[PDB]
Design a protein around this motif. Sequence first.
Motif, PDB file in Angstrom:
ATOM      1  N   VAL A  93       0.833  -1.103   0.116  1.00 12.92           N
ATOM      2  CA  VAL A  93      -0.233   0.091  -0.063  1.00 12.92           C
ATOM      3  C   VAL A  93       0.856   1.243   0.040  1.00 12.92           C
ATOM      4  O   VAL A  93       0.435   2.405   0.126  1.00 12.92           O
ATOM      5  CB  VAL A  93      -0.927   0.054   1.270  1.00 12.92           C
ATOM      6  N   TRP A 142      -5.500   8.220  -1.628  1.00 12.51           N
ATOM      7  CA  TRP A 142      -5.339   6.748  -1.835  1.00 12.51           C
ATOM      8  C   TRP A 142      -6.537   6.146  -1.076  1.00 12.51           C
ATOM      9  O   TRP A 142      -6.610   6.293   0.174  1.00 12.51           O
ATOM     10  CB  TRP A 142      -3.869   6.534  -1.531  1.00 12.51           C
ATOM     11  N   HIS A 157      -7.740   2.079   0.268  1.00 12.55           N
ATOM     12  CA  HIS A 157      -6.976   0.913   0.278  1.00 12.55           C
ATOM     13  C   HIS A 157      -7.676  -0.158   1.239  1.00 12.55           C
ATOM     14  O   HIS A 157      -8.478   0.403   2.121  1.00 12.55           O
ATOM     15  CB  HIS A 157      -5.516   1.055   0.618  1.00 12.55           C
ATOM     16  N   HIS A 193      -7.177  -2.817   4.901  1.00 10.08           N
ATOM     17  CA  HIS A 193      -6.368  -3.263   5.728  1.00 10.08           C
ATOM     18  C   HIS A 193      -7.277  -4.581   6.391  1.00 10.08           C
ATOM     19  O   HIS A 193      -7.982  -4.231   7.150  1.00 10.08           O
ATOM     20  CB  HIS A 193      -5.735  -2.360   7.003  1.00 10.08           C
ATOM     21  N   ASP A 213       1.205   3.991   6.376  1.00 12.08           N
ATOM     22  CA  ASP A 213       0.109   4.488   5.784  1.00 12.08           C
ATOM     23  C   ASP A 213       0.532   5.972   5.833  1.00 12.08           C
ATOM     24  O   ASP A 213       0.256   6.822   4.568  1.00 12.08           O
ATOM     25  CB  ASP A 213      -1.119   4.291   6.693  1.00 12.08           C
TER      26      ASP A 213
HETATM   27 ZN   LIG Z   1      -2.896   2.668   4.582  1.00 13.96          ZN
END
Ligand SMILES: [Zn+2]
Lengths: 191, 286, 278, 48
Positions: free
Chosen positions: C59, C88, C90, C92, C103
Motif C-alpha cells: 500500500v 489513496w 486501500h 487493511h 500509511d
Molecule cells: Zn494505509
Amino acid sequence: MVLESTMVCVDNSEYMRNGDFLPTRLQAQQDAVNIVCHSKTRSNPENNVGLITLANDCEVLTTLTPDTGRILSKLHTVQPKGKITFCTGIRVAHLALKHRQGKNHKMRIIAFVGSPVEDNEKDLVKLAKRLKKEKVNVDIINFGEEEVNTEKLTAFVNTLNGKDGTGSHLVTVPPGPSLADALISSPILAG
Amino acid sequence: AVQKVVVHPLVLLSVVDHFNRIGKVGNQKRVVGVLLGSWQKKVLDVSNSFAVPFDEDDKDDSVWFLDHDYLENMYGMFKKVNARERIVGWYHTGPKLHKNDIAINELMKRYCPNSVLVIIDVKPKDLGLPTEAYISVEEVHDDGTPTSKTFEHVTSEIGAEEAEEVGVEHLLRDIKDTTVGTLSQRITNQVHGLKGLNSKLLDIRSYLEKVATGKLPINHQIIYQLQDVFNLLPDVSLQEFVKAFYLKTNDQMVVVYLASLIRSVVALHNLINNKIANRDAEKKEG
Amino acid sequence: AVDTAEQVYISSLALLKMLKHGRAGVPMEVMGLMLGEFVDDYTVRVIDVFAMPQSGTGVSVEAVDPVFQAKMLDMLKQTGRPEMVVGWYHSHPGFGCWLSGVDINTQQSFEALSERAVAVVVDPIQSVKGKVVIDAFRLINANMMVLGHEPRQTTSNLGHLNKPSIQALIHGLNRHYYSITINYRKNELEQKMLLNLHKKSWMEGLTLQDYVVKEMLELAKNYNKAVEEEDKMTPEQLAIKNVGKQDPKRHLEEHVDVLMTSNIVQCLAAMLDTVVFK
Amino acid sequence: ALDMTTLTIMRYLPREVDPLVYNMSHEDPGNVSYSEIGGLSEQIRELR
Ligand SMILES: [Zn+2]
C-alpha cells in the motif's frame, strides 16, 4: 513540426485485385500509404495516420497513431473482395477525424477509388457541401479503375473545395499501368 | 451457448453512471460500453466493465465508430486487475434495438469468440429485469427465411455482491412474510393481468399489424408454437380444468377445508391469549 | 487555515468498486486511487474510484504506478469527465479501520500532492447491507497540534461526527491523525434502479410468476399445530398456577401468526384457480 | 480445500502421504517363483 492527423481510406475489392498498377494495385496502394505515412512522420513525429477500407465495410482498420507500425500491419492481409461504398466511408472518415481527442492536429483525408460508385451525384455533392462546412481537406487518388473521368468525384471535390477553396488535387487513375512514384508525386507537389 | 447471462449489480449501476457521465449530451440517446465477464461455465456472469466512446448516427446507421485503442488499452489494464476478467460482450442502452446493432455486433464477435449484447435500460420501468440479453448468430432458417441472421434472446439474471445495498436499501427494505399475500398477489395480478395481456395484445394487433408492419402474423414458429404451449389449458368453453368437479374441484374443497379448520382452532388460541392479556392483566386496580 | 467536521460523500459506484476490489485482494491488502472531487473544503464527494493493478511493494507510495495513473486519466478524459484524485483508498484486512506509520508516509505524499488527501480503509468484516466497516482518516500536522485541530462553526455536524466516535485500535494510533465523517453521496435514479432490482430482482420478484404450496404444506401445518399442542400446556399451567410470586411460564409460544400467514396465503391460491386462469 | 478469507469448502481433493498406512497397505511383496525352496508337497497341495 506541423501537427496533422490523416484518416486515409484504403480500398479492398475485386478491382483492387487487378495488378495493372505495379505488380498489384493493392501493393501499389500499400506503397502509396507508406510514402504518405513517411511524409507525415518527416513533417512531425506526433502526426497520426489511420486507414480503413471504403468497400462493403467502412469501420476503422486502425485508430490514428503516431507510430506507423500499426498502419503497415493493417495494410498486410487487407483481403480484397467487397464492392466500393465511398459515401459511407467518406462520412465515417470525416466524423472519425472529429472523434480523435487531438483535434488540434490538422485534419486531412486521402482515399483510393478502385471501382465506379453507384450513388446519386446529388447525394455525394450534399455530403461534399457538409464536408466544406467541416472544412477538412480531402484528396482522392483513383487507383487502377474509376468511374470514367471520376465525374461525380470531380463535382464532389469542387463542392468540397469551392469559392477559392483548398482545391485538393483529385488524381484520376492514369490509364493502363501507373508507377507508384508517379502517383506519389502529385500529392507531394500539392494537396 | 450463452445458456444464462447473470449480470453483477456493480455492472448494472456502471451503465447508469456512464449515462450520467454523458448526460451532458442527450444526442447519443444510448450508452455503449465494452462488457467484461467470465465464462466459468455455460452460465455467463458479467463483472467490472468499461465504456468505449461510440457515436450512433441516424444517417442509415452506418456512421458508427469504436475506438480500437480504448478497447485494447483499457481491457489490458482491467485484465491486469483481474485475470478472470475477459471480454465477454458489450452493453448498450436505447431499449429499442437500432439496426446498427448487428454491424457493431460483428466487430464485437471479432473481439470475443462467443460475445453477447446486454440492452440494459438506464431508466428502469416495471416488471421483469433491467438487462435484456441478445446474441447475434448466422444460420439457415429451416422454413427458409433469407439470411436468417438476427440477435437471439437469452435468459438474464442479477449477480451476487456483499455490502452493496447499505448505500441504497438501508433507507427502505421489506424482508418479511407480513406483506406476502397482502400486496404480493396484487403485483402479479397487476402485471400478469396487464403486462401479459399487453404482449398477447401485441400479437392480436399483429394479426393485422404484423401484416401491416410486422414480419408476419404467420411467422416465427414460437408465435404459434409457444402460444399453443401457453394454451396447454384449452382457453375457452368446457376447459375441463376448474370444471373437473370430481377432480380439481373436490380437491380444492379438501385442502381449503383442512386449511380453514386450523383457523377455527387458530382463533381459539388468539382469543384466549387476548382475554388473559386484557381481562386479567389490564384489570389490576391494586 | 482551520479544519472543520467536513463531510466525505461516497458515490455508490466508488463504494461498490472498493469493496469488490478489496474482497479480491483481502489476503494481499490491495490498494487503489480514489477519483474524488474537491468541490469545497466543507464538502468533498468521491464521484469515482479506480483500482490500481496489484503492486508487489504494497500500500506504499512506491507501489502506486505513475504511468498507470496518466494513461487511466487520459481514458477518463476521452470518455466522460475526469476528476483530480482526492487521495489513496486501500484495504487493511487485519484491523477493520486503522492507521499505520507506513500509511502516513503515503498519506503525507498525497497531502503534499493536494490538500484533503482522504484515505479510506475498507476490510473483509462485512454484512449483507449493514456493515460499513470502511472509515476515512486524514492526518493532523504536528505543527498544527498547538492550534486547535478542528475548530467547529456548526454544532450539529460535530454531533453527527461524534456518533461514530473512535475505535479502540484506532485510538491506539489516533494521535497525528483525525477521523473525517463519511456519508453516502446522494443516490436518486441510482438508488431507484437498485431499489427496483431489490424486491423484483435481489429478492424474489418474478411478478409474472411470483405467486410446496399444496404438497408439503399439510405436513408443515400438522407439525406446527403439534408443537402448539405441547406448547399450549405451559399456558394451561400458568392459568392453573396461583402465581402469587411472579414466575416465567413459557407463554408467548405464539406460532399463531405463522399458522395464520401460511394457511391464508395458500387459501389465496383460489385466486389463481378461478381468476388468474379462467 | 478451505478459502483463505471466506473459510468455506472450495473443492474435494484426497491426497495423504500415509507412511504408516502404506506399511499396513500393499507394502508386502509376493515371491514369483513357485518353488524358491521347493518343499511344496503340501504347500501347493493342502494349502492350495
Ligand atoms: Zn494505509
